[PDB]
Amino acid sequence: NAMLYPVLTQSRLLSDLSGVWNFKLDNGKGFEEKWYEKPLKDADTMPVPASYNDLKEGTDFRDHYGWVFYQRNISVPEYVKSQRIVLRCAAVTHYAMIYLNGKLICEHKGGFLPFEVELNDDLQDGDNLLTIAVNNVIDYTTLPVGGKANMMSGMPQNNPNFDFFNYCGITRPVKIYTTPETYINDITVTADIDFTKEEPSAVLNYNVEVELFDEEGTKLSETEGSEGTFEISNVRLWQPLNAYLYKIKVTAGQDVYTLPYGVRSVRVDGTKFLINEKPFYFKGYGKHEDTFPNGRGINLPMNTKDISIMKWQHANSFRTSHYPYSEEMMRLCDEEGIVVIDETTAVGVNLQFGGGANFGGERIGTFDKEHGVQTQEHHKDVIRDLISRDKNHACVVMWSIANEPDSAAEGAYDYFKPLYDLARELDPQKRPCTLVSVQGTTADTDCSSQLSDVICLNRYYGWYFGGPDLEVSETGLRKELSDWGKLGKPVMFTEYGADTVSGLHDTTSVMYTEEYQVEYYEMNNKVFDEFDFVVGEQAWNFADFATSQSLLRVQGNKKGLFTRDRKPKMVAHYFRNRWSAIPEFGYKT
Amino acid sequence: NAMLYPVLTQSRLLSDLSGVWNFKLDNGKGFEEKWYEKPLKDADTMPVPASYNDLKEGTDFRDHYGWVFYQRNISVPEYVKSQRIVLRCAAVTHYAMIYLNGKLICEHKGGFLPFEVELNDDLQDGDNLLTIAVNNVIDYTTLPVGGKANMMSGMPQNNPNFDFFNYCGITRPVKIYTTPETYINDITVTADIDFTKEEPSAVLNYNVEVELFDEEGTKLSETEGSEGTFEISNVRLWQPLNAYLYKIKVTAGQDVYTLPYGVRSVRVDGTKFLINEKPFYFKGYGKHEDTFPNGRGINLPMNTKDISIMKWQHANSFRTSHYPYSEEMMRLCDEEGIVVIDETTAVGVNLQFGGGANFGGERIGTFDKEHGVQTQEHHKDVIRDLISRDKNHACVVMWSIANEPDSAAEGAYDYFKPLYDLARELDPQKRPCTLVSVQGTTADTDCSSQLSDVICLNRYYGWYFGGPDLEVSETGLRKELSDWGKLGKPVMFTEYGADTVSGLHDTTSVMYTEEYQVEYYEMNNKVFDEFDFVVGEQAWNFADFATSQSLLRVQGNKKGLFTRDRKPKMVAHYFRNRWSAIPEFGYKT
Amino acid sequence: NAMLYPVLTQSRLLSDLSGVWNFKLDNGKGFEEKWYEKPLKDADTMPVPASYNDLKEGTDFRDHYGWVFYQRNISVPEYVKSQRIVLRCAAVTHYAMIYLNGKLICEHKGGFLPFEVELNDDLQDGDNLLTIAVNNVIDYTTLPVGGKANMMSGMPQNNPNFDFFNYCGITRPVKIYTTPETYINDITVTADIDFTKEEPSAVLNYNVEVELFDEEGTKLSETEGSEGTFEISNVRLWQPLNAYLYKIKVTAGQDVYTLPYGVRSVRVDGTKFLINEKPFYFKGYGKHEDTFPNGRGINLPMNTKDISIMKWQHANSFRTSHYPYSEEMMRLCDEEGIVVIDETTAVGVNLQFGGGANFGGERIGTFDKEHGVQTQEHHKDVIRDLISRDKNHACVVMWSIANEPDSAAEGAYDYFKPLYDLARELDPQKRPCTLVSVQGTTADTDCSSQLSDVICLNRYYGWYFGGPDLEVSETGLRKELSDWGKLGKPVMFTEYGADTVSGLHDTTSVMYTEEYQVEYYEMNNKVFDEFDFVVGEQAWNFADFATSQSLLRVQGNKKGLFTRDRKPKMVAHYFRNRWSAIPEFGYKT
Ligand SMILES: O=C(O)[C@H]1O[C@@H](N2CCN(C3=N[C@@H]4CC=CC[C@H]4Oc4ccc(Cl)cc43)CC2)[C@H](O)[C@@H](O)[C@@H]1O
Ligand SMILES: O=C(O)[C@H]1O[C@@H](N2CCN(C3=N[C@@H]4CC=CC[C@H]4Oc4ccc(Cl)cc43)CC2)[C@H](O)[C@@H](O)[C@@H]1O
Ligand SMILES: O=C(O)[C@H]1O[C@@H](N2CCN(C3=N[C@@H]4CC=CC[C@H]4Oc4ccc(Cl)cc43)CC2)[C@H](O)[C@@H](O)[C@@H]1O
Ligand SMILES: [Cl-]
Ligand SMILES: [Cl-]
Ligand SMILES: [Cl-]
Ligand code: NA
Ligand code: NA
Ligand code: NA
């Protein structure tokens, strides 16, 4: 349930197992032949952490269907056996099956949130054979959802019901860390914060399942007990593009753990998004965890380079489309002060794409209880695990339950209501919750008008709908955006963009050129600025990223402001100039 | 002196400290203000391992001159203090200065080979402040050599006397590992190997400062004592493009260590390069450790992707131009069976570039003992550390003492003779030694004709010399190559190529197009095939890589067969087709 | 009816009116305000010949709907009025309306074949105001056919039912030439040719509505009368990639005209295409008249450069997709010996694209006699004018009645039968006739199985149908191609290809890369080579060309082997290498 980020501490080890491992694609006999008992024969090599799809050559390897087998020896000196020995998989995409010495000792479903297993038993002395089997199959029981054909259909292999590539393998690091036999399992810190003062102060309610410091390291307070409080006069507020992390050192019996924490408040008021009781405006992008050749595999240099590029562009936020990102990127946004919209793996809960699923002649609606999505029981686990992991991040400003689901369809409200409730139940900060809405929903039809504190739109007026007629597409966008203002809620665009192949130009623009992309964003942004209830623009996407092959995809999705190697297209200088004249707070009040 | 690659063992920990650290550029006051004593104020963030140059924005950051300060807290539980606690910096480019709790506890010069320091003392209990200061200054005392102007001169900042970018910072991982208070410090394994038999067998002399296994893990022998021997009948030979690693588990008192070892032989005979007493032919490239945005920082996914690309292209070798590569890439070449020419940091020992260095009107010759290179004392340490690190790699087939030095100049022979001798003294396998020769040397003038077992040429007939006249450049290449045959030694080309901007084409080629690059290699390769003493072609470069800015460099060096993101130019399919019809052994005999 | 190419002769002038003219877009009032009577006010400038769409900036100009007005003064000295003064418009796209001094004196429909008008009357003395009004509207009465929406529909403006841009304006030159009051109006020359001899000879039946020369200019024969004959012993055959043009100087009363003529024979025999009674194999492309910025406007330098590129690539043929090309390019193919498949303007006679045309709920079939295409009466004129213009070209080897019509639909056979009959009636050489068949037709369903001497296919197995699965697409292509062999007729592919953005690469190819395009053609060509009745491959397209904007078109059609500026993609070197090992005659017999 609780996943504290493993760190070197006075009582905890941290043996990163990352490196080149043994690796073999399953041919369909890996389990009956029980490869996880003996070392892998005729093995290949594969570095972890990384998606494996792009790391060898050949369509049979990249488009492989099914299982793969990682393997690696591990050994602990016996003087360490006095402590707990837990193996924490930061992510395994999609389905993991961890064997140790031939014995199955863990299973996990969901390829973007951490999970651990105790190793004290089953850990012989000497060299131990650790095998991790990884499955990539997606279907109606997985998040993200796998369809029965390509998303372009109707216009043995996986068929993503989502517009990105099904990168799989050990996406994030596999580490080993120790704890004493009586350990800290979780920490929770909320902040009630008094703004009546001219010099605002704070009250920090915590709850351990304890010392406070400042940015430098100066000790400022101490308290006993599992539950307690800290009172900070003249407290320093964590703010967008101006972070400040206090340090919280929680000493229990024979175990210490330190957690950075940012002091800030998040509150919706009418048509206004308030961070520290100031009217915020989102500037930024939907991102992907997508680099070359790591695939989805974690890349800490790119994370820092992306964040640099952001501050260069005068952005302040992004959403973790369309899955929870790595812990490291979350802590980084804490240090660098980048506003994050944390989103679940719930993309493709919408059976109107992919041509469609049919039964006895009739088309299957999304939430058909016997032939439709079978994802809600798992959809709930994800909301639980994601909020348990990221509950303490001052950068996490709003939760996103799903990306472009069948929001306006029969069965939709009953599907999302318990998920929205579960989200507000478990988030101790009671943060805003939302859903990122497919094109085609209206204020009346969208079940997000009821459940969500913020309306997040994905609209492509001037690309899919209207292109290349930007004049017509403008009056379309104004007409729908006007009608959204009647909810009295805040509206932001979480996706808008036009595919642009870097290098293509015309003085009289056509689609796919850099000129058109700039004109597209000019037209959209002009209409955004007309409505005081629009509190955010986030372009799609930050950077070109890989997808499944299709007529509609020119070597991936090309809607990025930057190329896959982070080089700027002309639009990136357009946005940099616009976002430079737009503040973080009080844009239009 | 001895650097065994740290691994998880039954007696040794491995706590990788890699992650985001604190980071600050020095402004010139970092040492008088003693930043290494207290946590860094106004700090930035930086991931290790990585070169820092490309990870923030701004020419002042990328072209920074001098020092930077990394910082990070470290903590070990006290039950671990019973063991040795050693901190191993895999590489720090260029000059490292490791402080702990404010106390200077290590220094190192040379930014591409490992170095460690004991942490048992100075390691308080609790949270310890670990600071690493990194200097990037290059001059006549450094390897690589820094000049006084750009290499294009004559046609406060560093000026590389080498054609690549001066990426600096913590290039390779920083880890912590433990050993018992009586530990293994080094292992050495040579192989005398009997080919008179129809089923060749082997004798494995080892020497520890002990059990044998096969590829799977089946135990095959055991022996007592520090020095001993193994006899393997029907031994399996490590071979190019067909690796096989035995496992050697050396158990000493309360400490175990495992080392993979490949059984093969390397011997020069006349005009023939023999691996396992067969006539080898080199196919491949000079490489760089260059990726985006890591800079020189280690990238294990790219290493695997590069090696995949190699086997796709039917290559078999590369040289580590122009510095020793990471341990991980060396072990990978052991697993994947890739022939490596291991090269020192000795590039730029040649003062005829960069316009030149002048004194009282007269130009300074390279090996002027008072105004020239001051590098030999350090040049010797590098040969010592590099051979101590890579002595056991079956993939390391020949050593390269320097890249394009002033090989035919006054003082040259006296400079290189002790280095060549030192190389053969310390390599227990007595492997071939060479020097990669600048253009302009001849068989008579090049001091490598005496010292080297293999003649390695860098020739650009059809680019720098002769372009765009490939007809003229051909008869130039034949005329010089003929004269090299009189030494009766093997000759390979370690560098040849033409800058090619991906995407530029003409049916009637001009320079910088993909057509010209292909025609260039066609002309060169035609002349190579005429001479039975040519035993290898290695193109320059594997991939486009970053350099200092200059009129002659179109956003880096563009001589790669692949782009910086490893996408193939047309020449890469040309070479793949040629190398497919050329075997590894017995090409022409 | 008869259009001899105007040339400088001993009795005929040739005053090319090409240059910058006055030009104005109609706003809807140009005719009621009668702009053709007085010089154009507020005029713009425009060069003729050229398409006007790309020659100014702005989507309103490029996508203009309706009329434009050209204007220019013309003046003839009165001593020339003793002769005929005829104004010959080589092409005006689409609908021309020629005024002189304000009086309407000609009209023409069809924007790709020549038409003339006599100027002896209405030609005052002094400066005469010549106005040409040009209309671009396309609909169900035009060839090419204009639809009611974009071709991507169902997945005030023109909507091409064809995949190229609707370039309009004075496409080809406007010239003035004179004749005496009793003139030559037409010349027709057929060749019966005796191959029983070891040194074949010829008989040249002519017919004027007369002297013979050879390549140099040596006179070889003479004859009187309108109808006559020439007997050439040891005649030199015009051949593919080896042209030879005799010269025919026809002197009548006070008028001389010279016409080049090539002696060759064209005959279908079973599954064999015979030129000079030898078994031919087509190598080449579907082309376009498309360059920058001329649009469709004639470009003689590119024609020569394209033909050079062809001979560089070892091509031998192309088709004039999808309209008759310029006279100059036809005469050039005579000189350079390039085999041409002459095709009419009949593209888009197929109402299954563009989403579709609907009436009372039911969809309109193509050849619905009241709501479908209204093109046959004009379709006949085009066949008449095209064969009258190009009847004498030895390079014109087969006629193409239409490109991808609804060949397998109700009403189709009755639509095409009179067109096919008309084609064989008026071609004195009785040359093969064909139809280029959309994907989806089979040997049974395609009405071209009956009417056509050669089966011409457009198939995209591995792009539109099957991509990116080339394995599956292969067995699809073999299965359909096998079934075509049962007609015992010759089968060639007039179109196959994959969109490829120059510069995109992967070692593991995906769609739109240069690697995929090469693999696509490898798979297709492998299946072509399996069937002795396949007598030709012609790739689509020769070069990237402009189209209307759509999601499916990355700045135009990118299926070219070369870019729009004729620079080669990787596939162009693939084809050059293949076509080099494939002869013109007797490929497989
Ligand atoms: O498209 C993009 O760039 C990004 O936009 C968002 N959505 C994508 C799919 N969407 C589609 N909407 C259609 C809308 C209208 C008709 C058919 C539709 O059927 C298709 C068919 C193929 C494809 Cl590819 C997309 C769609 C909705 C928008 C996602 O959040 C991103 O992950 C994605 O990458
Ligand atoms: O050049 C390349 O691509 C690769 O080739 C090799 N060498 C580079 C420098 N070399 C030069 N030779 C000159 C040769 C003739 C006249 C002046 C010379 O002065 C200059 C001036 C500027 C530059 Cl940039 C290069 C040189 C020798 C070849 C290196 O091993 C690589 O590291 C390098 O990347
Ligand atoms: O496409 C190309 O590159 C070239 O190929 C030929 N034809 C194009 C249109 N064709 C289509 N066939 C579809 C086939 C299957 C389903 C829908 C179809 O609906 C569409 C929709 C949009 C477009 Cl764009 C094309 C088509 C048939 C092939 C033409 O001779 C060329 O002029 C053209 O340029
Ligand atoms: Cl977003
Ligand atoms: Cl090399
Ligand atoms: Cl064609
Ligand atoms: Na975009
Ligand atoms: Na090169
Ligand atoms: Na093509």
Side-chain angles (χ1 to χ4, degrees), chain A residues 54 56-60 62 152 154-155 292 463-464 467-468 471 501 503-513 516 549-556 558, chain C residues 54 56-60 62 152 154-155 292 463-464 467-468 471 501 503-513 516 549-556 558:
Chain A
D54 278 344
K56 309 277 162 173
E57 304 304 308
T59 72
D60 288 359
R62 180 200 55 207
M152 151 136 225
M155 274 160 114
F292 183 79
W463 186 251
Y464 296 132
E471 287 172 32
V501 180
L504 307 187
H505 292 268
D506 204 301
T507 46
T508 298
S509 65
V510 294
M511 288 167 67
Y512 286 95
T513 66
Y516 188 90
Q549 310 197 37
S550 153
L551 280 197
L552 286 188
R553 286 279 165 276
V554 187
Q555 198 173 32
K558 284 287 192 293
Chain C
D54 278 344
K56 309 277 162 173
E57 304 304 308
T59 72
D60 288 359
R62 180 200 55 207
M152 151 136 225
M155 274 160 114
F292 183 79
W463 186 251
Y464 296 132
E471 287 172 32
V501 180
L504 307 187
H505 292 268
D506 204 301
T507 46
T508 298
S509 65
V510 294
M511 288 167 67
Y512 286 95
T513 66
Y516 188 90
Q549 310 197 37
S550 153
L551 280 197
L552 286 188
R553 286 279 165 276
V554 187
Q555 198 173 32
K558 284 287 192 293

Side-chain angles (χ1 to χ4, degrees), chain A residues 45 54-55 57 305 308 336, chain B residues 45 55 57 305 308 336:
Chain A
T45 46
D54 278 344
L55 290 190
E57 304 304 308
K305 179 54 165 192
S308 291
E336 290 296 327
Chain B
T45 46
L55 290 189
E57 304 304 308
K305 179 54 165 192
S308 291
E336 290 296 327

Side-chain angles (χ1 to χ4, degrees), chain B residues 450-508:
Chain B
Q450 326 309 154
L451 306 175
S452 301
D453 319 271
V454 189
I455 297 310
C456 291
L457 303 175
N458 289 358
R459 293 304 183 272
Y460 289 87
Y461 287 100
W463 186 251
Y464 296 132
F465 307 91
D469 206 305
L470 293 175
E471 287 172 32
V472 177
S473 314
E474 195 179 327
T475 120
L477 172 70
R478 196 178 295 106
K479 174 179 171 303
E480 180 188 347
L481 194 49
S482 267
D483 177 271
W484 278 103
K486 81 199 187 185
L487 300 172
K489 289 182 158 169
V491 185
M492 67 183 296
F493 288 83
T494 39
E495 276 180 43
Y496 72 124
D499 282 78
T500 297
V501 180
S502 184
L504 307 187
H505 292 268
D506 204 301
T507 46
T508 298

